[PDB]
Design a protein around this ligand. Structure first.
Ligand SMILES: Nc1ncnc2c1ncn2[C@@H]1O[C@H](COP(=O)(O)OP(=O)(O)O)[C@@H](O)[C@H]1O
Ligand SMILES: O=C(CO)[C@@H](O)[C@H](O)CO
Length: 528
């Protein structure tokens, strides 16, 4: 059998990564270009420039273009067989934007295979330093956007999110306000995802519905740009964005540039690029009723949503593997640092003793409940440690083992309560995917399984955006919108079952979840 494959790209904050996935849906090749290490002339740290104000965070667009030259030439030098690539897709670090100068599409459509991309596109950008997801300098544009469309809730119902500083519309509004000459000289605005797709097409790619939802611009229901949001951000913005498309769209064939320079087959299809979190959702193969918990410095919840309920917290996006439905992200600032601090304070400085504390305590923790927010939390907006005993009295401390369970049960009950607030419901078919450092702890995943009353599976997500992108490319080849994504990726490696809810978990948490939710509201009302 000749080995056919799809490429899955990731234009990330710190690097450009690629995976090659074969027709049996196995990864057989991976490569990357690290920005600080491989393009040090740009002077980035973590792939970005943090500006003097401590809020403006950007990346040079030509660094991303040049990184693509380096990685393609690094693949060629390793003997990678580009003639086997049937299709490609990719992921882009979300929210980041690219501003193409007037006349740049002529340079894209007239690329010569004798030259590199960086050389040929060096004068194509009206903005050299692109805002990225880490930028937090647009608070005034956020408040202006919300006020213009009738408020924070009105903006979320419409776009799936209230105004967030990193969301593209607020960044576009600042560039227009502070550099109106460069904005007037911009013919096209892309996301990192659609910018990367444009490079492979040798023409402008549209923005997909899923990454297009991370801008405070797209009407997530109607799948059209909100005229009110467009007008409140910057003038003539719709023509600079172009109509958005379903994520499972063949946006074109690969440019002849890649055919002639690297030996891609002329029939290689470019499937629309999407955001890195939507691509990881595809990579993890979430379906209706499923949830993914990414445990790390920040804890991230990925939800499948048939019918969303946009809120002042979280982000609802159009679903990348099912354009009729949605997905959501909920981010928790107090993640792995709290779990480490509580371990070090309450048990021996090891994860084994943390697990023994969970093994030596009952489900429900005897009615002892805890909230652990040493840094200001996002979901919800609370700071401090708040402990309550079985009589709902506020207490100064717990015994060490009770503390460990109060943290872990509390953190997972909060994820369930906040997911449910966005319209998520546990179903009979529900599978929980857990990833990150803490997913290596069986006792922690047992609490997660017990709290949701659903089985927990463990998966490696180091390349989930790359892998999800290659799956999405295969879905485009296997029939696209005519076939379900889930049927295409049935052949992919299955995740390992790590825990199933204990008998009686349902009875314990059905009574305790509403009490935890009421205590959260009590702490919140004491803040205002
Ligand atoms: N067994 C484990 N239980 C809980 N957290 C863990 C475990 N292994 C690693 N981690 C933590 O996950 C984080 C990795 O990111 C680190 O803070 C690390 O201490
Ligand atoms: O801003 C977000 C999500 O809203 C980050 O996860 C970036 O997508 C990472 O590149």
């Amino acid at each position: 059998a000749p080995r056919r494959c799809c490429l899955g790209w990731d234009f990330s904050t710190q690097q450009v990564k690629v995976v090659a996935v074969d027709a049996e849906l196995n990864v057989f090749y991976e490569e990357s270009v690290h920005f600080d290490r491989d393009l040090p002339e740009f002077g980035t740290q973590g792939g970005v420039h943090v500006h003097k104000d401590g809020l403006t965070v950007t990346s040079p667009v030509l660094m991303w273009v040049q990184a693509l030259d380096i990685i393609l030439e690094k693949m060629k030098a390793s003997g990678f067989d580009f003639s086997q690539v049937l299709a490609l897709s990719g992921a882009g670090q979300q929210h980041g934007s690219i501003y193409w100068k007037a006349g740049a599409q002529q340079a894209l459509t007239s690329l010569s295979p004798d030259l590199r991309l960086h050389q040929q596109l060096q004068d194509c950008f009206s903005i050299s330093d692109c805002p990225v997801w880490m930028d937090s300098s647009t608070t005034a544009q956020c408040r202006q956007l919300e006020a213009a469309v009738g408020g924070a809730q009105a903006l979320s119902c419409l776009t799936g999110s209230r105004a967030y500083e990193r969301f593209t519309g607020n960044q576009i509004a600042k560039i227009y306000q502070q550099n109106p000459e460069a904005y007037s000289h911009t013919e096209r605005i892309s996301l990192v995802s659609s910018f990367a797709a444009s490079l492979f097409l040798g023409s402008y790619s549209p923005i997909d519905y899923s990454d297009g939802s991370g801008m405070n611009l797209l009407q997530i229901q109607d799948k059209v740009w909100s005229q009110a949001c467009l007008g409140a951000c910057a003038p003539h913005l719709e023509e600079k964005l172009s109509p958005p498309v379903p994520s499972c769209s063949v946006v074109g064939a690969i440019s002849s540039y890649y055919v002639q320079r690297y030996g891609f087959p002329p029939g290689c299809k470019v499937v629309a690029f999407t955001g890195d979190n939507p691509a990881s959702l595809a990579g993890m193969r979430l379906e209706e009723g499923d949830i993914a918990v990414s445990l790390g410095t920040s804890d991230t919840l990925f939800l499948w949503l048939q019918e969303p309920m946009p809120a002042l917290e979280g982000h609802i996006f159009c679903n990348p593997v099912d354009s009729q439905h949605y997905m959501a992200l909920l981010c928790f600032k107090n993640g792995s640092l709290m779990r480490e601090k509580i371990r070090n304070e309450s048990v021996s400085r090891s994860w084994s003793d943390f697990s023994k504390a969970l093994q030596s305590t009952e489900m429900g923790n005897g009615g002892n409940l805890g909230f652990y927010f040493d840094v200001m939390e996002i979901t919800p907006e609370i700071i401090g440690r708040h402990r309550f005993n079985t009589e709902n009295h506020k207490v100064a401390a717990f015994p060490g083992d009770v503390e460990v369970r109060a943290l872990i049960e509390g953190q997972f009950m909060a994820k369930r309560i906040h997911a449910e607030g966005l319209g998520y419901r546990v179903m009979s078919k529900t599978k929980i995917l857990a990833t990150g450092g803490a997913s290596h702890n069986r006792e922690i995943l047992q609490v997660l399984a017990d709290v949701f009353d659903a089985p927990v599976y463990v998966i490696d997500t180091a390349n989930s955006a790359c892998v999800g992108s290659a799956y999405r490319a295969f879905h485009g080849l296997a029939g696209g919108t005519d076939v379900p994504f889930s049927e295409v990726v049935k052949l992919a490696p299955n995740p390992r079952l790590a825990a199933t809810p204990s008998p009686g978990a349902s009875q314990v948490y059905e009574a305790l979840l509403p009490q935890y939710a009421k205590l959260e509201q009590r702490i919140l009302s004491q803040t205002r």
